[PDB]
Amino acid sequence: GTSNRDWWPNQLDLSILHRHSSLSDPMGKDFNYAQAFEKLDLAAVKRDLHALMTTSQDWWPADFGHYGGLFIRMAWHSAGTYRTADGRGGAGEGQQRFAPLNSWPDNANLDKARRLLWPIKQKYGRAISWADLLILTGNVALESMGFKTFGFAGGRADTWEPEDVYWGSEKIWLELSGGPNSRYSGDRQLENPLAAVQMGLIYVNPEGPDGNPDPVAAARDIRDTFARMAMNDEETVALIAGGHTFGKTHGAGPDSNVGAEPEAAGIEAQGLGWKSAYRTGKGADAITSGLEVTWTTTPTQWSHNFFENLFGYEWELTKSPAGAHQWVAKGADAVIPDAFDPSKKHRPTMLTTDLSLRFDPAYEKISRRFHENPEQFADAFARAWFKLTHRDMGPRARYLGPEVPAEVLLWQDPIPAVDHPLIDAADAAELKAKVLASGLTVSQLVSTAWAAASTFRGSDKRGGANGARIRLAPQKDWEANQPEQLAAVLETLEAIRTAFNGAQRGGKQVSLADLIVLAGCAGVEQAAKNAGHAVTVPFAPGRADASQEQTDVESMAVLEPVADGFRNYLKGKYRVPAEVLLVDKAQLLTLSAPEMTVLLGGLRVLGANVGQSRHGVFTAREQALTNDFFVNLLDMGTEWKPTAADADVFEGRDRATGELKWTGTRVDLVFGSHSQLRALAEVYGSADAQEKFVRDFVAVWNKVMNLDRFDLA
Amino acid sequence: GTSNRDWWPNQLDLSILHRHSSLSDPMGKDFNYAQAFEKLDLAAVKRDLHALMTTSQDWWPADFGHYGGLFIRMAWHSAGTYRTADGRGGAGEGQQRFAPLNSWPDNANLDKARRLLWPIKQKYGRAISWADLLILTGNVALESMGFKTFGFAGGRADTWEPEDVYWGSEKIWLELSGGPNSRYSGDRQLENPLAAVQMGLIYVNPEGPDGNPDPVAAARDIRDTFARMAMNDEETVALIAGGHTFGKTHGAGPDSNVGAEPEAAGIEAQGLGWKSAYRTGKGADAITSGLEVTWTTTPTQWSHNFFENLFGYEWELTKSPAGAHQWVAKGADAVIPDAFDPSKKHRPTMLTTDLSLRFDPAYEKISRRFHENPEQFADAFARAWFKLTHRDMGPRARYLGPEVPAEVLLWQDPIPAVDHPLIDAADAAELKAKVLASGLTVSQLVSTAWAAASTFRGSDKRGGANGARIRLAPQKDWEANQPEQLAAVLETLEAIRTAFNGAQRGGKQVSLADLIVLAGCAGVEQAAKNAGHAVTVPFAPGRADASQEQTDVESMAVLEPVADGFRNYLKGKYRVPAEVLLVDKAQLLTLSAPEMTVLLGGLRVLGANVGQSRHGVFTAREQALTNDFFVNLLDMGTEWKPTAADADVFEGRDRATGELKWTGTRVDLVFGSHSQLRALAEVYGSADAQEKFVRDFVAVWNKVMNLDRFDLA
Numbered sequence A, B: 001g002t003s004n005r006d007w008w009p010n011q012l013d014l015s016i017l018h019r020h021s022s023l024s025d026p027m028g029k030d031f032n033y034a035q036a037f038e039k040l041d042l043a044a045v046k047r048d049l050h051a052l053m054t055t056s057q058d059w060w061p062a063d064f065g066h067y068g069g070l071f072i073r074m075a076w077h078s079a080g081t082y083r084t085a086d087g088r089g090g091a092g093e094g095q096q097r098f099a100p101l102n103s104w105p106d107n108a109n110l111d112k113a114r115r116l117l118w119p120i121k122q123k124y125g126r127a128i129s130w131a132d133l134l135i136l137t138g139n140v141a142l143e144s145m146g147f148k149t150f151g152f153a154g155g156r157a158d159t160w161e162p163e164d165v166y167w168g169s170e171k172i173w174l175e176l177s178g179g180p181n182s183r184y185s186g187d188r189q190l191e192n193p194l195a196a197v198q199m200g201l202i203y204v205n206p207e208g209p210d211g212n213p214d215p216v217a218a219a220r221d222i223r224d225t226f227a228r229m230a231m232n233d234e235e236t237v238a239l240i241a242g243g244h245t246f247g248k249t250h251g252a253g254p255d256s257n258v259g260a261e262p263e264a265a266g267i268e269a270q271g272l273g274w275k276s277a278y279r280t281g282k283g284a285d286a287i288t289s290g291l292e293v294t295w296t297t298t299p300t301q302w303s304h305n306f307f308e309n310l311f312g313y314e315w316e317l318t319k320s321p322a323g324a325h326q327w328v329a330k331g332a333d334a335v336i337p338d339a340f341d342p343s344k345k346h347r348p349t350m351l352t353t354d355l356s357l358r359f360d361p362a363y364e365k366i367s368r369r370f371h372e373n374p375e376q377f378a379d380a381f382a383r384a385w386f387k388l389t390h391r392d393m394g395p396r397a398r399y400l401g402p403e404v405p406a407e408v409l410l411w412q413d414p415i416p417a418v419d420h421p422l423i424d425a426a427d428a429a430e431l432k433a434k435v436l437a438s439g440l441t442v443s444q445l446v447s448t449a450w451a452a453a454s455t456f457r458g459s460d461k462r463g464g465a466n467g468a469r470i471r472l473a474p475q476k477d478w479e480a481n482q483p484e485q486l487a488a489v490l491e492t493l494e495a496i497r498t499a500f501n502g503a504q505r506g507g508k509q510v511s512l513a514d515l516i517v518l519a520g521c522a523g524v525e526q527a528a529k530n531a532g533h534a535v536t537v538p539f540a541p542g543r544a545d546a547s548q549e550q551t552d553v554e555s556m557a558v559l560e561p562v563a564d565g566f567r568n569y570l571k572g573k574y575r576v577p578a579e580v581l582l583v584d585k586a587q588l589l590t591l592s593a594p595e596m597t598v599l600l601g602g603l604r605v606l607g608a609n610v611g612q613s614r615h616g617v618f619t620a621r622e623q624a625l626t627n628d629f630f631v632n633l634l635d636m637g638t639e640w641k642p643t644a645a646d647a648d649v650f651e652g653r654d655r656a657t658g659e660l661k662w663t664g665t666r667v668d669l670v671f672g673s674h675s676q677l678r679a680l681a682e683v684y685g686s687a688d689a690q691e692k693f694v695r696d697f698v699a700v701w702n703k704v705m706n707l708d709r710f711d712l713a
């Protein structure tokens, strides 16, 4: 059946903005997962999970009699698709159970692990999400084997369809680099926003870079991918050594014995895949990655044997039974247990990528300290495992249940507690009046609040106006934020705040974060008034102000908007058309197409553009909140042509006279071109639409202002 | 960016069932288009449309000074995508303004027509939909030019994204037959459900079949395609001769002058396409189809000149200026006006397909009769134009405004008025009790009501339980409907009805239509009681019984379910996998994936299967309303394999014992395979879900029972 994507393969795609509708959701519209989880008997689930670890099923027999390793692997893959560049991936939505992740080659046989979990998911039903369960299972596996975890938070609600993520352009699973859709260029530079070396891998190739078994060069790939998942050297060493304390790899026979991945398998396979023709197909004969490595003498017990072996032996290159490169300690005795035959033992083995921890010089220092000081290794691994599995969960206010760690970590972008009464409605009105009396303009007010709030991304729930991090490094100096203009606005708002707080009794105070938002609300109210409409913009206090010391500057970098079509801003020149970047930003802000459309057309005429550019400012009453953008954009009396200077800027001239009326960018003019967006623009540009425009604009503005307000959830 | 569709191109696609969400819709959730239209001043819109007809715009100058022809073509094409096979296409959703239809070659320059309408759309806003406006504008064009229409109904709500329609498999626009994705096979047999001869055409090729200019062979294609659009010979001759009484074609220069269609055009084209490099590119120089024909001496006025010319001359084959085949009148004088130069005239011309109306023997008889009796021609064309443009609108209860024709037509599948008091809640309880006392079983009561109601399709809003057409030819004899069992149930229900109606005072009576549905309700109630649950199923009376004479048997044939996954029924063997057919039927029924899931799992355990098949009946308590289907389908204790006899039937055996537990079809087992469906099955198969399953099932049941109930909208 030929589709629109087939006829017009480069048209913009809006269906990313309408995923996750009420239509696809089997739960009622009022279902609240946090309420369900908060009444779950978590202790009882964990007891069930404990028992499962050593209850072997014949259709996928447990190695060593214990599923713990398989489950740690499962939970680390659940979390391990995360990319800091856009916050997509991670464990937070349980996406491992949907395409394409359920069928990535790095997730081979995790379909078995997920299936083992069904009886428990079934027992507790909607009170524990799959997303929570994958992670909880990994924790319980660690605990069952003697490892003390740092804690666990619930609150990952399940999702019901695949997320739309760019995982790369290769059309072949695992394609080595250098092909026609290579994700590398230059001196081994991986394209943003990717965080893996080959399509269908979690991070790196366990045999080495493009299969070359050189630990040193494999370390460079480890470091790069891990950094693109927000982990530094110490965290990376702790995570890899920690995880490979447990279990084993599977490569009992040649890879060609393994059949179709789950999305390709027959219907009778009932959602499982990688069925193997090698011997029994499972257990002692299992083939997963094609490597055959068991790291430690006690694969079902926490120990410090991974570093004892890594440093204690000299290693030589050998091949698994499937032909993959791996390493053996030939000088060793057969000290490693066999997974099923109590009468067999094996020599110690390692992956290329494990040897990286000893032969990369920066890693060796850390490895050695963890070898000599295994308590430091256990503490690091516990912290990094928590971070790994909670990195995309958002503000601590979303964390549920009795096991949440009390320690506040810098990576969580922490917000201080509020310990004082909040402003009320009359106070908000008085502050809005003081703000407008200061001389700050509609444009200044709207721009500053937009800049503060629109760093939010729903992918990992980082960013937003809570914290007032706009006033701190590095946000204050981001080019999009107009650093000198922003400094003048913030100074005036801070003086207002100081005056208001100084006049209060009884501990009542307003935060700067709240005032930035409220002042943007005043700007929108005044814009509506400029257009002859009295409206009240809703405003919810309770934001707090974070300090510089509570703000990791390096980790904030990935939130910098380099493209923000809402402010007609592009930091430099990109391969991807600006309209594509606009939809991407909309998806991250959780906006539908209609909400995107209303919001942009309003911001244009409020003076939100960076630099006060006239591009898209299709009004003669700037700073009045009207539907002028759409009425003028859709006026057939105006003809548009790309400029000679810049093919991405367009001039709109009167069709009869040739007089120049407006200029625009691709972001502006897509609303008059794309057939779905233009149908939207038509609604808002019609003669009956002034009231609808204003209401829908105020509603989306308020949505944006509240994106990180999980304290009010 | 590689997608799931790329990796797994034949995996089932559920996003068709979650199109048209509240997310993509710019109107608020409570917007009611019928209420908006009812307050429109239709007389005012029509005056603006009359003015527009002769308000020529320089960017697309009106032929003969009058856009009427262009607009009739625009309306005919809006309605002309309709296929009786599935009810998809047609004018009823305004899909002409979206991909792919906005860019079909046959809709070239209709983007201009649509744009001429924007000032009117804009003026009236939400009170007139694009979908209604296209049709209204065609009617007003006809009226402007002297032709009295039969009527007009409003009520076509706009839609906001492309509908998912199978338009064929060709990957080349306009591809001639016999290619790798040929829509023809055999003795020119067009594949169902298609109703056009080439990809991107409305019906036929105006040059002739695959471009060969034989009017007789063209006639065969006209007859077949028009019959696939629900028109017979009389209506087809009236429509083609009526339409080509007006206006002209456009082929002033070679097609190679015309540029990108709208979805491929640059952003500066602002939603328009087919920009031409030939001379001025418009007006006297216009290129649309490549043909250059003007049919009549008065192209802006209704006349009898089409048939005078058709019969009055002998025709010679010639070429337009673009090289296309067309016909010219032998020895004729230059009597046809030029569109722009009052000093030029032209000889009469015709398309191959116009000559079909004279050279096909059956058409010639009709054409002659219309030539001799032009009042018969006028009346038939009025009637046919109304049918054309309203065929997908559904029951008359949907028709809005002051111009709706009072005459009831056979094609509207008319339902008689109700002229008596309706049963109340006490009466409903009394009838449900008599139904349960009669001996009829849960399976019989559910099956019959399913059969009556599940004929509805939302594509053209035909079918459903109103009417009690299940008791008439041809529904009573459909294989899916189990004709002998159906007759036994109808006999018992009719005796209950007769007894009930005979005991009433005043004119209170229950229709058989209502009783069929009420009796199904009772069956679901009894099923829930069998499972130990106390459930009341909602019921809305008000259906009436249609007569056989109000039920066109040939037009009902296209509603026969040849595949009905909900009854585990497949009439024969199809190219398309049964799961694909299931989703297609769910889309027709307007169900989401969750609704499809709940409904199928319930139907299976209630005994709705055709033939009492055990396939999918995964319960030991048939006729009790439980979530057994899901709990058993997801039990990993059972292993599934395709049978030796039939690869599309599967056996579920105890994994440890080998004992046979169940059998299933692909429709059954897709719920345990497809990763989105299995996620849904899991919610309903969980230990906390029995009550939710029951409630959700009763809701979807009632939805299906009410699909055609536009008298309660």
Ligand code: HEM
Pocket (backbone or CB within 6 Å): A063, A068, A069, A070, A071, A072, A073, A076, A203, A204, A205, A206, A222, A239, A240, A242, A243, A244, A246, A247, A248, A249, A250, A251, A287, A288, A289, A290, A291, A351, A353
């Ligand atoms: C450089 C990073 C890493 C590489 C290349 C990698 C590579 C692999 C490979 C190839 C397997 C074998 C899969 C099989 O054949 O069954 C695996 C197993 C395992 N990995 Fe990793 N690993 C990485 C990091 C991690 C991390 C961060 C964790 C967790 C903290 C982890 C935990 C495990 C566990 C527990 C297994 C055992 C699975 C079982 O017992 O079934 N690994 N690793």
Ligand code: HEM
Pocket (backbone or CB within 6 Å): B063, B068, B069, B070, B071, B072, B073, B076, B203, B204, B205, B206, B222, B239, B240, B242, B243, B244, B246, B247, B248, B249, B250, B251, B287, B288, B289, B290, B291, B353
């Ligand atoms: C066998 C069926 C038909 C064929 C093959 C056919 C073909 C065509 C073509 C090729 C054009 C020229 C397009 C252009 O170059 O501008 C056209 C124009 C038109 N047809 Fe048809 N047609 C069919 C049926 C219809 C019907 C059912 C109606 C309406 C009831 C219709 C009314 C129009 C009118 C009004 C125009 C004139 C457009 C103008 O003045 O711009 N035709 N037709």
Ligand SMILES: [Cl-]
Pocket (backbone or CB within 6 Å): A088, A089, A090, A095, A163, A164, A165
């Ligand atoms: Cl994601």
Ligand SMILES: [Cl-]
Pocket (backbone or CB within 6 Å): B088, B089, B090, B093, B095, B163, B164, B165
């Ligand atoms: Cl459609």
Ligand code: NA
Pocket (backbone or CB within 6 Å): A087, A088, A089, A090, A092, A392, A458, A459, A460
């Ligand atoms: Na994420």
Ligand code: NA
Pocket (backbone or CB within 6 Å): B087, B088, B089, B090, B092, B392, B458, B459, B460
């Ligand atoms: Na339709």
